[PDB]
Amino acid sequence: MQIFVKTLTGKTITLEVEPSDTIENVKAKIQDKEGIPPDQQRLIFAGKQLEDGRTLSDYNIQKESTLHLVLRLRGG
């Protein structure tokens, strides 16, 4: 499917994904398209945080939905 990723600075990118894609796959596509490492990416749809290891289907992500991309620095 086609989805969209709106950043926090008012920028939007277009992604090609499938519900079977894990979150690190989506962050990896965002990396290929933008150069932002998946470590510095916090994805949120409808307030819910997209956890690594889960899939897009684990959330109510429909075709041409728009996720929110926050740029962070990991602590751990």
Please, which experimental method was used?
X-ray
CA–CA dist 8, 29 (Å, integer): 18
Residues counted in the chain = 76
The position carrying tokens 């992604």 is 15
CA–CA dist 29, 15 (Å, integer): 7
Give me the helices (H) in 1-76, please.
23-34
CA dihedral 29, 16, 14, 61 (to 10 degrees): -100
The pair of three-digit structure tokens given for residue 76, joined into one six-digit string: 């751990």
Resolution (A): 2.3
Distance (Å) of CA 53 to CA 9, 11, 12, 58: 26, 26, 24, 10
